[PDB]
Design goal:
It is classed as protein binding. Keywords: pdzd3, membrane, PDZ domain, protein-binding, protein binding. The assembly is trimeric. The entry is titled "Crystal structure of the 3rd PDZ domain of intestine- and kidney- enriched PDZ domain IKEPP (PDZD3)". Chains A, B, C are PDZ domain-containing protein 3. Three copies of one chain form a homotrimer. By secondary structure, chain A is mainly beta. Chain A has a single domain, classed as Pdz3 Domain, CATH 2.30.42.10. In chain A, 14% of the residues lie in helices and 40% in strands. Chain A contains two helices and seven strands. Chain A has a four-stranded antiparallel beta sheet, with helices on one face. In chain A, a hairpin with a 5-residue loop joins strand 2 and strand 3. The two termini of chain A are 26 Å apart. Chains A and B meet through strand 2, strand 3, helix 2 and strand 7 of A and strand 2, strand 3, helix 2 and strand 7 of B.
Chain lengths: 95, 93, 95
């Protein structure tokens, strides 16, 4: 999946996503869009649950820890550029 | 890592498995959601768990459908080994 | 269950819980933390869905109504002490 760079403007309820860290098999942390809220900025920009957050403000956050990634998003204030890599829709299953 | 034993119900085990690849491209299978009031939840599973084994056999670095087929292949009862997350590493923004 | 005293700090999207009243069979109100939002202060401060709220800012809210309990939480501003009694999280079933 090609990275997609989206520009969000937050309102009173924020950008509209849940960021959660998961470590891969190599130990390196990934920060994932765990859930994206309907009708809020991220969703309106086409961000999806399962997206990996790969850049904030044009700078890579691939392999970066959670608090460092969150502070980088917070450091940008009202308007933020975020780059994501989308999942394959068929690699989720309810069992 | 914790080994949990689940008994299936009419609506299954009660979790959403989702693949995410790491930076070396290796997939991890993550328990993205654990349904309230269903076996997985009541078996001790957490959302954010990584699935590391099925029926005592490692599924680490295995693809999604291989992983699901192995869980399916076990029928009504299933052993699953998970590694839990740090629950202080999720943030709504 | 032994009560637990949690200390929450409010963020831009609030504390992140739904308070719901349930009355006893005798009509007496109790206030319950019905849902706790992932990634928000309540959750991160260890609150569980199904918690019963028994004190705010050190004062009992046992037997108190809903508007009254909310006002007490609101009265504490950005930082609030909440005392809860946790449920048995395995005593839930989807039918």
């Amino acid at each position: 999946m090609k990275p997609r760079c989206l520009h969000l403007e937050k309102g009173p309820q924020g950008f509209g996503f849940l960021l959660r860290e998961e470590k891969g098999l190599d130990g390196r942390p990934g920060q994932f869009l765990w859930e994206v809220d309907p009708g809020l900025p991220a969703k309106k920009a086409g961000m999806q649950a399962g997206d990996r957050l790969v850049a904030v403000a044009g700078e890579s956050v691939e392999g970066l820890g959670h608090e460092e990634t969150v502070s980088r998003i917070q450091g940008q204030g009202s308007c933020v550029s975020l780059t994501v890599v989308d999942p394959e829709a068929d690699r989720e299953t309810s069992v």
